[PDB]
Design a protein around this motif. Structure first.
Motif, short mmCIF file in Angstrom:
data_model
loop_
_atom_site.label_atom_id
_atom_site.label_comp_id
_atom_site.label_asym_id
_atom_site.label_seq_id
_atom_site.Cartn_x
_atom_site.Cartn_y
_atom_site.Cartn_z
N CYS A 110 0.89 -1.16 0.00
CA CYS A 110 0.00 0.00 0.00
C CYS A 110 0.95 1.24 0.00
CB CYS A 110 -0.88 -0.03 1.24
SG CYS A 110 0.07 0.14 2.79
N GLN A 111 0.42 2.46 0.12
CA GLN A 111 1.27 3.68 0.15
C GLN A 111 2.27 3.68 1.35
OE1 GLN A 111 -2.65 5.98 1.27
NE2 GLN A 111 -0.94 7.38 1.59
N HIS A 112 2.00 2.89 2.39
CA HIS A 112 2.86 2.89 3.60
C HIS A 112 3.98 1.83 3.60
CE1 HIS A 112 -1.22 4.36 4.87
NE2 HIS A 112 -0.47 5.44 5.15
N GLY A 113 3.96 0.93 2.61
CA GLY A 113 4.96 -0.13 2.55
C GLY A 113 4.37 -1.51 2.33
N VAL A 114 5.13 -2.54 2.70
CA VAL A 114 4.74 -3.92 2.53
C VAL A 114 3.61 -4.29 3.50
CG1 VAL A 114 5.54 -6.32 2.77
CG2 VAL A 114 7.02 -4.59 1.67
N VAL A 115 2.53 -4.85 2.96
CA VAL A 115 1.37 -5.31 3.72
C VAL A 115 1.44 -6.83 4.03
CG1 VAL A 115 -1.17 -5.63 3.63
CG2 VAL A 115 -0.12 -3.46 2.81
N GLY A 116 1.75 -7.61 3.01
CA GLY A 116 1.86 -9.05 3.16
C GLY A 116 2.30 -9.75 1.90
N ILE A 117 2.16 -11.08 1.87
CA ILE A 117 2.57 -11.84 0.69
C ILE A 117 1.48 -12.80 0.27
CG2 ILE A 117 5.14 -11.73 0.95
CD1 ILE A 117 5.05 -14.53 2.42
N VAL A 118 1.41 -13.11 -1.04
CA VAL A 118 0.43 -14.09 -1.55
C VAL A 118 0.65 -15.44 -0.82
CG1 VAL A 118 -0.36 -15.41 -3.56
CG2 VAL A 118 0.27 -12.99 -3.85
N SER A 119 -0.44 -16.04 -0.32
CA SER A 119 -0.33 -17.30 0.40
C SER A 119 -1.40 -18.33 -0.06
CB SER A 119 -0.42 -17.06 1.89
OG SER A 119 -0.48 -18.25 2.66
N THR A 120 -2.56 -17.87 -0.57
CA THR A 120 -3.62 -18.80 -1.04
C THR A 120 -4.29 -18.21 -2.32
OG1 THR A 120 -5.58 -17.88 0.14
CG2 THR A 120 -4.20 -19.40 1.43
N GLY A 121 -5.17 -18.97 -2.97
CA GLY A 121 -5.93 -18.46 -4.09
C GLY A 121 -6.88 -19.48 -4.68
N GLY A 122 -7.49 -19.10 -5.78
CA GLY A 122 -8.33 -20.01 -6.53
C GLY A 122 -9.57 -19.34 -7.05
N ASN A 123 -10.01 -19.74 -8.24
CA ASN A 123 -11.27 -19.29 -8.83
C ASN A 123 -11.50 -17.78 -8.83
OD1 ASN A 123 -12.24 -22.00 -9.36
ND2 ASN A 123 -12.33 -22.22 -7.11
N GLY A 124 -10.48 -17.02 -9.22
CA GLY A 124 -10.59 -15.57 -9.23
C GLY A 124 -10.42 -14.92 -7.87
N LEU A 125 -9.84 -15.65 -6.91
CA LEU A 125 -9.52 -15.12 -5.59
C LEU A 125 -8.00 -15.15 -5.36
CD1 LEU A 125 -12.30 -16.95 -3.58
CD2 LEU A 125 -12.12 -14.43 -3.87
N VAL A 126 -7.52 -14.29 -4.44
CA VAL A 126 -6.14 -14.32 -4.00
C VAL A 126 -6.14 -13.96 -2.49
CG1 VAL A 126 -5.72 -11.98 -4.89
CG2 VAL A 126 -3.77 -13.49 -4.40
N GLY A 127 -5.40 -14.72 -1.72
CA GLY A 127 -5.28 -14.54 -0.28
C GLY A 127 -3.87 -14.11 0.07
N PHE A 128 -3.74 -13.17 0.99
CA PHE A 128 -2.45 -12.64 1.41
C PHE A 128 -2.25 -12.83 2.93
CE2 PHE A 128 -4.35 -9.91 -1.89
CZ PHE A 128 -3.39 -9.91 -2.88
N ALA A 129 -1.09 -13.33 3.29
CA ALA A 129 -0.71 -13.50 4.68
C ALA A 129 -0.24 -12.10 5.17
CB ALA A 129 0.44 -14.51 4.78
N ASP A 130 -0.98 -11.49 6.09
CA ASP A 130 -0.61 -10.18 6.66
C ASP A 130 0.69 -10.22 7.45
OD1 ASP A 130 -1.31 -7.39 7.22
OD2 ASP A 130 -1.58 -8.05 9.30
N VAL A 131 1.49 -9.12 7.42
CA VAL A 131 2.71 -9.02 8.23
C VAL A 131 2.74 -7.71 9.04
CG1 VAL A 131 4.10 -10.54 6.73
CG2 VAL A 131 4.24 -8.04 6.43
N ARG A 132 1.72 -6.80 8.89
CA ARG A 132 1.70 -5.49 9.57
C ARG A 132 1.67 -5.57 11.10
NH1 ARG A 132 -3.27 -2.91 6.33
NH2 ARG A 132 -3.97 -5.09 6.58
#
Ligand SMILES: COc1cccc(Cl)c1CC(=O)N1C[C@H](C(N)=O)C[C@H](C(=O)NC2CC2)C1
Ligand SMILES: [Zn+2]
Length: 139
Positions: A110-132
């Motif tokens: 986001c504008q403040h820096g790294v939020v997280g990394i891609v960890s899951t997905g499927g069927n037009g979805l994407v999941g991100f593991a938060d690190v904030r």
């Protein structure tokens, strides 16, 4: 594949951690799909400390960045895989967007820096593991 390099830490998906990551282990959480290992060189990234719900992630299966709207970190049911049984993954944020298994590790920012990394997905979805919430990454 992909990692976050902040200070003397390397953050990766726990399912993609190498023998070297495990030999230099700082912290890991199977319920979040995260592993942090120590590094000798100073890292290139800044961690966001915010509640943004919009950002941009890198999608390696398209060689492109995409803007997304994502949910707040929460407990989400994730189907069984080669690395984990059928379980709830915590601190996960979902968005509508393209992702494939090999996209894991792509950074969400986001504008403040790294939020997280891609960890899951499927069927037009994407999941991100938060690190904030990992405040100790900054010290
Ligand atoms: C971005 O991932 C996808 C995108 C589209 C569809 C699908 Cl099935 C995925 C894959 C997905 O959801 N997982 C998540 C899971 C976890 N975090 O619990 C780890 C999984 C795994 O074992 N990966 C190794 C390479 C085979 C892959
Ligand atoms: Zn932000």
């Amino acid at each position: 594949s992909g990692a976050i390099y902040v200070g003397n830490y390397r953050v990766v998906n726990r399912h993609l951690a190498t023998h070297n990551d495990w030999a230099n282990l700082v912290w890991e959480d199977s319920s979040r799909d995260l592993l942090v290992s120590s590094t000798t060189a100073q890292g290139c990234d800044t961690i966001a400390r915010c509640d943004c719900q919009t950002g941009v992630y890198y999608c390696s299966s398209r060689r492109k960045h995409y803007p997304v709207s994502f949910s707040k970190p929460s407990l989400i049911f994730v189907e069984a895989s080669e690395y984990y049984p059928a379980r709830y993954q915590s601190h996960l944020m979902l968005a509508v967007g393209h992702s494939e298994p090999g996209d894991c590790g792509g950074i969400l920012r986001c504008q403040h820096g790294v939020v997280g990394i891609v960890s899951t997905g499927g069927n037009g979805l994407v999941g991100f593991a938060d690190v904030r919430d990992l405040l100790w990454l900054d010290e």
